[PDB]
Amino acid sequence: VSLWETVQKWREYRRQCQRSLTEDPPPATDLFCNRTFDEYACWPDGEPGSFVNVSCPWYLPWASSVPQGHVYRFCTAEGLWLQKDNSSLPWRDLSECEEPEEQLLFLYIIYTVGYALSFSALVIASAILLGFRHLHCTRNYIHLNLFASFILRALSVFIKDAALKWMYSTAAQQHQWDGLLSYQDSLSCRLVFLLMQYCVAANYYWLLVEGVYLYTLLAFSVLSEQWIFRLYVSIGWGVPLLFVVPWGIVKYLYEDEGCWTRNSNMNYWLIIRLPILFAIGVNFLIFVRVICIVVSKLKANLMCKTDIKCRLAKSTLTLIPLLGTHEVIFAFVMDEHARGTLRFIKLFTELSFTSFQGLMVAILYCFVNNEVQLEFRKSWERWRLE
Amino acid sequence: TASIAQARKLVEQLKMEANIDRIKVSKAAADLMAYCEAHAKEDPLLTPVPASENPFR
Amino acid sequence: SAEDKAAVERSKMIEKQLQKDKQVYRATHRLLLLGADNSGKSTIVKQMQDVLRTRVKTSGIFETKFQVDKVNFHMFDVGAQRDERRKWIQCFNDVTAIIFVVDSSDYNRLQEALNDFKSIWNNRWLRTISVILFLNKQDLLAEKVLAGKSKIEDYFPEFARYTTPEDATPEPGEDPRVTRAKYFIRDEFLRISTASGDGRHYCYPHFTCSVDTENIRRVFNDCRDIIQRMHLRQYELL
Amino acid sequence: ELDQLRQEAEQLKNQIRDARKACADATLSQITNNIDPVGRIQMRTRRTLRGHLAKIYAMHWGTDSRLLVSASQDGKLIIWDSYTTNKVHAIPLRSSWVMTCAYAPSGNYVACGGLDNICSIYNLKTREGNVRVSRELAGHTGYLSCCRFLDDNQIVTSSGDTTCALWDIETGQQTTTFTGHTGDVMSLSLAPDTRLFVSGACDASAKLWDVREGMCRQTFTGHESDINAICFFPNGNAFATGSDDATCRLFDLRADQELMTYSHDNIICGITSVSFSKSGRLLLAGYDDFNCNVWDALKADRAGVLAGHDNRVSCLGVTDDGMAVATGSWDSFLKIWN
Amino acid sequence: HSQGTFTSDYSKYLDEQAAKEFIAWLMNT
Amino acid sequence: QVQLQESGGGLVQPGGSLRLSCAASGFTFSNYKMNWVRQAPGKGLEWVSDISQSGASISYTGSVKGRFTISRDNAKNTLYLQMNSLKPEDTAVYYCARCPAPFTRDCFDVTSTTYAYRGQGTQVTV
């Protein structure tokens, strides 16, 4: 599979051909069938004029399936080969030594549109929150840090994709098969994908700090504002480092295949996945508790005229993006046993919703937020008086 | 009977306040303007001071 | 920059003290106590140099401190002040809640209390302050006997029109007549409270059996409900 | 007889009204015609003082136009250095419900009072460098609403018991009481020469008092509701009143009647604070709609707005050099304008 | 997470596809 | 000077009719909520009825509900109170009262003979 390994085998096949460049069949007559080869495979001599054949190479991958088939050539004392045009193309039976996925490109386009949309709105949303001094509070500080984690996730995604294209696509454009084998080993490439793991983990945990704060607001015995903020910032930005760095250590030491991109060992993939699932789990419990509190307040909310249903539906939809509960659906269950069409379904909903999660969060907590709208109306009226 | 006590005090105060000198409002309006242009170049609120001498930059 | 250094040092010690003072201030709840026939302030204290009060005989505000479940509470009862409260009431525009104790056993002045409650509810500086209603002196031996019909401050409903609410939860073993009367009076205050109040502020009715009773748990629970409602409104979830 | 006393007093009111009408030969607006307007006054927030927790109810500037004291309902007095926004003192108050504060002319004392009906005097300049309450003046049977120092030993306070009193700091007692108001007195302002002072009450009426006598000399009526603030035009011959009727007015002792009413149709909020400029050309008010307004005192036309506060402006104070204007508000923020 | 799974799936494909293209460019051509 | 003056009080047998007009002078009548209070002998002030600025919302004490009726004339600057079917428990002095602040819903005025913007009164005996 690995291009690297195939090229490695090709290079040692030239060493094999150099071994056969010393061990030589006797040259034949004036003009032996024998000619020459470039890389290809090693050449035989043989009496000029026989059904001479060479076994199939064992290194070619599409020939690991079939190495029984060989090359069916023919010749005489011409000195050359069966050539439609001399020294241009031979008649070799290469058909026995040789034998898509458009969903991935479809998925790529979908998420990268949402991430671009989310990034554009988040920087606008972040500026609005920081710009107005009135909206400076602990709650908005958690919102600002949540926006940064979303922004970091979006930027890291773009870079990881550029890297992946730099790995093979644009490398093939240069028509060089030596420097890319080295980008594949540059420690610079490893840090690119290591950053993506941290940015993704930070985004999930800053969603866990968004719901753990909200829960502590609804539970009394509140502590010092200063102290809690420092702990929340430490949890949002430091706890992900507690399992992202060990994952990189295991990769560098026992995997280090290609830029830490392939999860060959599923056990090492759990190092990051399990803390992510723990964060998603706790957030789901907070999501249930908050909704239970909301329905309890609406049930005694004076009117409580069945509009319970509408308002409860209008309160559940605005709380899903702020806590990332859409992950719950196909997460705990469908892991990496999810194969077949279930894979595509689980990937499509996760990639699309998460990419557009930043846009929804920015809209729901910066633009339709009454506090901001009344702040904008005030500011515009303040300038209107001049 | 404290009603008539409060009224007696009110009567005395009302009848004693009505015996004060009352100049014309036209005269009274003159001094208010006369004071205004008088210290009109003093108060910074009217003529802003240069930023060099302004303690609040 | 030698004495300007000393100034900036002084300012920082001051800021450090102010930080601790904020920390203490935000962790407490301030309540205003209103009414004219209340006695719960003298029993709350008990529940929670010396203790001799040297308060000036003309003190205009009395203050009580009590702690339910380690949450601190400051209740302020007015003292030597005049009848007119149109201007001193504005000071309490940021209290956690307002406790409005009303004597439900004197039918002659219930209208005057209803008017006071309506004026509190409709005040522009208290539009966002939730009130806790304390129908005091709930032992109604007056409706159990005949003398005193409730058809004065109710020459209309209890006066043949008001039926006990279906949501009513009459306390175990008690005449349905006093249950109707007390729930009628309670509905009379709630009619005025819903006339204008919405998400901004709510009114919590409680039938305070006299004043000799557990009575701080109610206030703690209602303050908890008020705080939870405020927070849920900032997150636009209510 | 009550009836007779009343009828006599009605006739007295008619005589006062007739005498006042006989002096209004020309309107102040008519005389001030063909006079240059001030021109729009753009104002910017040069300094913003932060640190108060609850709403600020009062502020007073010092005689050096640098130090200012501020009172907030959290129970804190803070002396600011508006030049550098540096806190100098932070006196912890003994009763959080403070409604008024003052700065002594010598700068050695501050005062505060409120719903506790007690004025407290703090010694700023102590040998050990620590402020501590020096005197607690008691006797008022209603909330202290405004207190203002006359000197290091005398101070006049107004209260909600419809009375104003003069106290002696070193004796500890009232020396003179000034009765006559029927509603709660909300503010007072001592005069430049310090010989007289005015007070506005909730009876929609203002009175002029004589500290050294004890009697009200003039009584000025005009407003429709509670007078919430009062000050003095620099010369000491006038004063401005701000009431809940959304109207500011100016009065004159010798005129014994109002001169100009400053109002606008779009303004329906009351006036919480009133202060005059150095030369008296600019009258600054404070409003319940979170803004403050500069009023041209001669033409009764709005000439500036100091929008920027997020809650109700409660206090206002122009300096003694005229070089600054402070505003305090229910949003626990102070601002300095220029 | 889903982002890691998609990148791993994408890398498995792009790599193999490029290896096939490599053989073509080299051995066959 | 805010003044309010009432009229129409007199002597009438129970079950009769009486009309009380309160003349206002000194303020914009349209901007204020108006109310009616009375003081029975041996009792303090007690609110009776109320009319908003435009006269839309009207509320009455239960003891006089269905009988006494209140109205206002914005142009004439007056508040009115028609009384019919009297009983001898309305023997009181009627003070026409005004709310303190304009464009405001709250009303603190029935105060202990301290309120400034309230009338002097008309004795009504039945």
PDB file of C-alpha atoms in Angstrom, chain C residues 57-158:
ATOM      1  CA  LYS C  57     -33.047  55.232  68.838  1.00  0.00           C
ATOM      2  CA  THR C  58     -33.660  57.069  65.541  1.00  0.00           C
ATOM      3  CA  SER C  59     -32.082  54.470  63.243  1.00  0.00           C
ATOM      4  CA  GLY C  60     -33.741  54.568  59.880  1.00  0.00           C
ATOM      5  CA  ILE C  61     -32.833  51.124  58.646  1.00  0.00           C
ATOM      6  CA  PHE C  62     -32.512  47.921  60.575  1.00  0.00           C
ATOM      7  CA  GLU C  63     -30.647  44.997  59.168  1.00  0.00           C
ATOM      8  CA  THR C  64     -30.761  41.314  59.771  1.00  0.00           C
ATOM      9  CA  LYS C  65     -28.300  38.673  58.740  1.00  0.00           C
ATOM     10  CA  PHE C  66     -29.174  34.987  58.460  1.00  0.00           C
ATOM     11  CA  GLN C  67     -27.658  32.045  56.619  1.00  0.00           C
ATOM     12  CA  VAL C  68     -29.637  29.285  55.002  1.00  0.00           C
ATOM     13  CA  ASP C  69     -27.398  26.534  53.611  1.00  0.00           C
ATOM     14  CA  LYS C  70     -24.289  28.734  53.835  1.00  0.00           C
ATOM     15  CA  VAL C  71     -25.723  31.308  51.470  1.00  0.00           C
ATOM     16  CA  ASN C  72     -25.711  34.635  53.216  1.00  0.00           C
ATOM     17  CA  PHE C  73     -28.748  36.860  53.335  1.00  0.00           C
ATOM     18  CA  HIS C  74     -29.184  40.522  54.265  1.00  0.00           C
ATOM     19  CA  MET C  75     -32.738  41.633  55.046  1.00  0.00           C
ATOM     20  CA  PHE C  76     -33.378  45.338  55.489  1.00  0.00           C
ATOM     21  CA  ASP C  77     -36.408  46.595  57.301  1.00  0.00           C
ATOM     22  CA  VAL C  78     -37.079  50.301  57.259  1.00  0.00           C
ATOM     23  CA  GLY C  79     -37.250  52.139  60.517  1.00  0.00           C
ATOM     24  CA  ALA C  80     -37.596  55.734  61.391  1.00  0.00           C
ATOM     25  CA  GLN C  81     -38.842  56.872  58.078  1.00  0.00           C
ATOM     26  CA  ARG C  82     -41.895  58.845  57.080  1.00  0.00           C
ATOM     27  CA  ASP C  83     -44.890  57.403  55.299  1.00  0.00           C
ATOM     28  CA  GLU C  84     -43.951  58.541  51.798  1.00  0.00           C
ATOM     29  CA  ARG C  85     -41.791  55.888  50.063  1.00  0.00           C
ATOM     30  CA  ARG C  86     -41.823  57.245  46.542  1.00  0.00           C
ATOM     31  CA  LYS C  87     -38.176  58.276  46.800  1.00  0.00           C
ATOM     32  CA  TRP C  88     -36.419  55.950  49.221  1.00  0.00           C
ATOM     33  CA  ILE C  89     -37.661  52.862  47.488  1.00  0.00           C
ATOM     34  CA  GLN C  90     -35.519  53.562  44.499  1.00  0.00           C
ATOM     35  CA  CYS C  91     -32.502  52.538  46.495  1.00  0.00           C
ATOM     36  CA  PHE C  92     -33.604  48.972  46.368  1.00  0.00           C
ATOM     37  CA  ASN C  93     -33.565  48.610  42.607  1.00  0.00           C
ATOM     38  CA  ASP C  94     -30.940  45.899  42.679  1.00  0.00           C
ATOM     39  CA  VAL C  95     -32.007  43.716  45.615  1.00  0.00           C
ATOM     40  CA  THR C  96     -32.400  39.993  45.021  1.00  0.00           C
ATOM     41  CA  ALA C  97     -36.074  40.028  46.034  1.00  0.00           C
ATOM     42  CA  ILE C  98     -38.683  41.977  47.990  1.00  0.00           C
ATOM     43  CA  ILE C  99     -40.592  40.349  50.849  1.00  0.00           C
ATOM     44  CA  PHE C 100     -44.122  41.771  51.097  1.00  0.00           C
ATOM     45  CA  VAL C 101     -45.844  40.614  54.280  1.00  0.00           C
ATOM     46  CA  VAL C 102     -49.608  41.178  54.244  1.00  0.00           C
ATOM     47  CA  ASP C 103     -52.077  40.585  57.078  1.00  0.00           C
ATOM     48  CA  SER C 104     -54.795  38.395  55.554  1.00  0.00           C
ATOM     49  CA  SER C 105     -56.924  38.355  58.727  1.00  0.00           C
ATOM     50  CA  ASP C 106     -57.986  42.033  58.701  1.00  0.00           C
ATOM     51  CA  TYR C 107     -60.381  42.315  55.845  1.00  0.00           C
ATOM     52  CA  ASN C 108     -60.810  46.046  56.220  1.00  0.00           C
ATOM     53  CA  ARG C 109     -57.325  46.924  55.112  1.00  0.00           C
ATOM     54  CA  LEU C 110     -56.708  44.219  52.570  1.00  0.00           C
ATOM     55  CA  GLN C 111     -57.584  46.613  49.793  1.00  0.00           C
ATOM     56  CA  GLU C 112     -54.979  49.061  51.043  1.00  0.00           C
ATOM     57  CA  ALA C 113     -52.411  46.298  50.980  1.00  0.00           C
ATOM     58  CA  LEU C 114     -53.474  45.230  47.504  1.00  0.00           C
ATOM     59  CA  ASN C 115     -52.949  48.841  46.422  1.00  0.00           C
ATOM     60  CA  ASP C 116     -49.470  48.888  47.970  1.00  0.00           C
ATOM     61  CA  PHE C 117     -48.584  45.626  46.221  1.00  0.00           C
ATOM     62  CA  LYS C 118     -49.852  46.984  42.895  1.00  0.00           C
ATOM     63  CA  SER C 119     -47.825  50.178  43.331  1.00  0.00           C
ATOM     64  CA  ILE C 120     -44.720  48.109  44.063  1.00  0.00           C
ATOM     65  CA  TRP C 121     -45.364  45.880  41.073  1.00  0.00           C
ATOM     66  CA  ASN C 122     -45.901  48.735  38.608  1.00  0.00           C
ATOM     67  CA  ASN C 123     -42.963  50.919  39.752  1.00  0.00           C
ATOM     68  CA  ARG C 124     -40.486  51.535  36.980  1.00  0.00           C
ATOM     69  CA  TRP C 125     -37.472  50.929  39.252  1.00  0.00           C
ATOM     70  CA  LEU C 126     -38.820  47.666  40.591  1.00  0.00           C
ATOM     71  CA  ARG C 127     -40.163  46.230  37.298  1.00  0.00           C
ATOM     72  CA  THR C 128     -37.372  43.634  37.302  1.00  0.00           C
ATOM     73  CA  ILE C 129     -37.469  42.810  41.041  1.00  0.00           C
ATOM     74  CA  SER C 130     -39.389  39.659  41.905  1.00  0.00           C
ATOM     75  CA  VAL C 131     -41.424  39.807  45.111  1.00  0.00           C
ATOM     76  CA  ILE C 132     -42.141  37.102  47.678  1.00  0.00           C
ATOM     77  CA  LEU C 133     -45.694  37.288  49.006  1.00  0.00           C
ATOM     78  CA  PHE C 134     -46.197  36.429  52.687  1.00  0.00           C
ATOM     79  CA  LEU C 135     -49.890  36.274  53.584  1.00  0.00           C
ATOM     80  CA  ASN C 136     -49.379  36.720  57.316  1.00  0.00           C
ATOM     81  CA  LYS C 137     -51.588  35.506  60.169  1.00  0.00           C
ATOM     82  CA  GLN C 138     -53.047  32.618  58.186  1.00  0.00           C
ATOM     83  CA  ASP C 139     -54.840  31.265  61.232  1.00  0.00           C
ATOM     84  CA  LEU C 140     -58.306  32.456  60.191  1.00  0.00           C
ATOM     85  CA  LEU C 141     -60.641  31.850  63.107  1.00  0.00           C
ATOM     86  CA  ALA C 142     -62.519  34.741  61.608  1.00  0.00           C
ATOM     87  CA  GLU C 143     -63.902  32.895  58.613  1.00  0.00           C
ATOM     88  CA  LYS C 144     -64.545  29.840  60.698  1.00  0.00           C
ATOM     89  CA  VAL C 145     -66.983  31.919  62.683  1.00  0.00           C
ATOM     90  CA  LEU C 146     -69.691  33.985  61.070  1.00  0.00           C
ATOM     91  CA  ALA C 147     -68.957  37.554  62.076  1.00  0.00           C
ATOM     92  CA  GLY C 148     -67.134  39.280  59.259  1.00  0.00           C
ATOM     93  CA  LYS C 149     -68.139  38.481  55.716  1.00  0.00           C
ATOM     94  CA  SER C 150     -65.429  38.662  53.089  1.00  0.00           C
ATOM     95  CA  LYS C 151     -67.770  40.654  50.867  1.00  0.00           C
ATOM     96  CA  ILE C 152     -66.201  44.079  51.401  1.00  0.00           C
ATOM     97  CA  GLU C 153     -62.855  43.893  49.627  1.00  0.00           C
ATOM     98  CA  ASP C 154     -64.675  41.467  47.498  1.00  0.00           C
ATOM     99  CA  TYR C 155     -68.152  42.741  47.150  1.00  0.00           C
ATOM    100  CA  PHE C 156     -68.024  40.809  43.968  1.00  0.00           C
ATOM    101  CA  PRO C 157     -66.239  37.518  43.883  1.00  0.00           C
ATOM    102  CA  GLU C 158     -66.003  35.728  47.155  1.00  0.00           C
TER     103      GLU C 158
END
